[PDB]
UniProtKB/Swiss-Prot annotation:
A zinc finger (PHD-type) spans 14-75. The gene is PHF24. The lineage of its organism: Eukaryota, Metazoa, Chordata, Craniata, Vertebrata. This is PHD finger protein 24. It comes from Homo sapiens (Human). The chain holds residues 123 to 198 of 400 of the full protein. It comes from the Eukaryota.
Length: 89
């Protein structure tokens, strides 16, 4: 194979490291910032998590404070009809 890596000084460890890249960036990380679990939208579609035809007229609107909310959070922040269907009870 091949080997070659040194440096007894390891970089800071942040819990906000992509689960597919394990890397962060100054700017806001996707999907969200607060949501501990961070994963690049592309890392999902690529690997094989989404691969769904979700043609939309939007590129990336997560960074913003009030934009897209990942599944984990699934917050009803966005102002729009979110008719839900909970188990009849
Ligand atoms: Zn990633
Ligand atoms: Zn989220």
């Amino acid at each position: 194979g091949s080997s070659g890596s040194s440096g007894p000084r390891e970089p800071v460890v942040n819990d906000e490291m992509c689960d597919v890249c394990e890397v962060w960036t100054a700017e806001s990380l996707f999907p969200c910032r607060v949501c501990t679990r961070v994963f690049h939208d592309g890392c999902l579609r690529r690997m094989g998590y989404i691969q769904g035809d979700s043609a939309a007229e939007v590129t990336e609107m997560a960074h913003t404070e009030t934009g897209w909310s990942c599944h984990y959070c699934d917050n009803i922040n966005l102002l729009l009809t979110e008719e839900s269907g909970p188990s009849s009870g």
